């Protein structure tokens, strides 16, 4: 199950 | 014994034409279970283990929508970083990203990871505490500042200590026939002839799961690292693994030499002898 949370941008 | 769930992501820029190649893969322990490749017709997260195909269509849409969003994140990261490091668009660059959780022997959360690399060098890593960051240089410092201000560690804690351990436990459940079965290594010893006075014993460990393994030579009870070769643990191709160690010995003295084997699917360790 991949993180449903909008991923952080570098 | 402890268990793990890890997702590995890679984006390579393609400065000649088009967008970056993005490959994602998912693992429980040493067993791959999902993949995405942007160079495939599918454009869906795909299964790579029989136990995960139990999961209904809402799971697969769910995972595809997410995996596709991670692709888009990593496209942008390739751009940002290119600017931080002052690089041209002539060159091909790579962003890597890995994250996941472990459960202990106690089936509770043990550790979480969330770390990035650029052109194969450590960039910004989430620490054990899951409340702080290790930035490798001044570009990752830029990233760190953002991420402190924005309470990013807190959001990845909810997942790493929560949702991630939940799903690991679900998978280990649905896939227990294979995932909680340890295959002990089928072992045996072979014997070559370097000379009239010198021969090579080799110790083989085949078809074992998980990959974690230790092979050690003992001459007359004492460990012996000298005159030994070994190979890195290698996949068999069927989800199990292979490794060997070998030692070089005087002909006639092979009764002295024993090979010890520790594998978490072995109650007592093993001892081979020629």
């Amino acid at each position: 199950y991949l993180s449903p949370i909008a991923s952080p941008l570098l | 014994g402890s268990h793990s769930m890890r997702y590995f992501f890679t984006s390579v820029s393609r400065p000649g034409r088009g967008e970056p190649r993005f490959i994602a893969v998912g693992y429980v322990d040493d067993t791959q279970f999902v993949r995405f490749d942007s160079d495939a017709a599918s454009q869906r997260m795909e299964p790579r283990a029989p136990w995960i195909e139990q999961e209904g269509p809402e799971y697969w849409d769910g995972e595809t929508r997410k995996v596709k969003a991670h692709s888009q994140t990593h496209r942008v990261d390739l751009g940002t970083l290119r600017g931080y490091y002052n690089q041209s668009e002539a060159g091909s660059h790579t962003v890597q990203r890995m994250y996941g959780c472990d459960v202990g022997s106690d089936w509770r959360f043990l550790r979480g990871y969330h770390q990035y690399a650029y052109d194969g060098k450590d960039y910004i890593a989430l620490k054990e505490d899951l409340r702080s960051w290790t930035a490798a240089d001044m570009a990752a410092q830029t990233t760190k500042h953002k991420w402190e201000a924005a309470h990013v560690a807190e959001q990845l804690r909810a997942y790493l200590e929560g949702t991630c351990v939940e799903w690991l436990r679900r998978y280990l459940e649905n896939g227990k026939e294979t995932l909680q079965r340890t295959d002990a290594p089928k072992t045996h010893m072979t014997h070559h002839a370097v000379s009239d006075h010198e021969a090579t014993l080799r110790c083989w460990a085949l078809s074992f799961y998980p990959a974690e393994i230790t092979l050690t030579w003992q001459r007359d009870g004492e460990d012996q690292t000298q005159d030994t070769e070994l190979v890195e643990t290698r996949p068999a191709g069927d989800g199990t693994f292979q490794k060997w160690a070998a030692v070089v010995v005087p002909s006639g003295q092979e009764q002295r030499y024993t090979c010890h084997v520790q594998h978490e699917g072995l109650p007592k360790p093993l001892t081979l002898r020629w």
């Binding site: - | 590995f8 890679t10 390579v12 490959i23 893969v25 693992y27 791959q32 993949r35 490749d37 790579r48 060159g91 091909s92 660059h93 790579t94 890597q96 890995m98 690399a117 052109d119 194969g120 060098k121 450590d122 072979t190 070559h192 080799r202 190979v231 890195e232 290698r234 996949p235 068999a236 191709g237 069927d238 292979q242």
Partner: protein, 100 residues
């Protein structure tokens, strides 16, 4: 851009017996970047059936891939893995040994 030469291992899934179907594995690892050509050879010529594993990498960010194909060993025949990467001037060739 850090660049790392690929380690290489050629072997069969199962113990090698003539006339008995097996799988030839070439396992490349320790490398960076991920672009790599890996071909499995029978008596010098290329093989066509070859799959590979999905791109994955280790703790130190170094990639690994397993290329593989079904084959039936014979006494006569010879097998090898040819690999080309950026960190190599020309293609590297590991022959498949007996007890490799």
């Amino acid at each position: 851009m850090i660049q790392r030469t690929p380690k290489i291992q050629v072997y069969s899934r199962h113990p090698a017996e003539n006339g008995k179907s097996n799988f030839l594995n070439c396992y490349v690892s320790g490398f960076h970047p991920s672009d790599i050509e890996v071909d499995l050879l029978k008596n010098g010529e290329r093989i066509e059936k070859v799959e590979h594993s999905d791109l994955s990498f280790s703790k130190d960010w170094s990639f690994y891939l397993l290329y593989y194909t079904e084959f039936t060993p014979t006494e006569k025949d010879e097998y090898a893995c040819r690999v080309n990467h950026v960190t190599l001037s020309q293609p590297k060739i590991v022959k498949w040994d007996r007890d490799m």
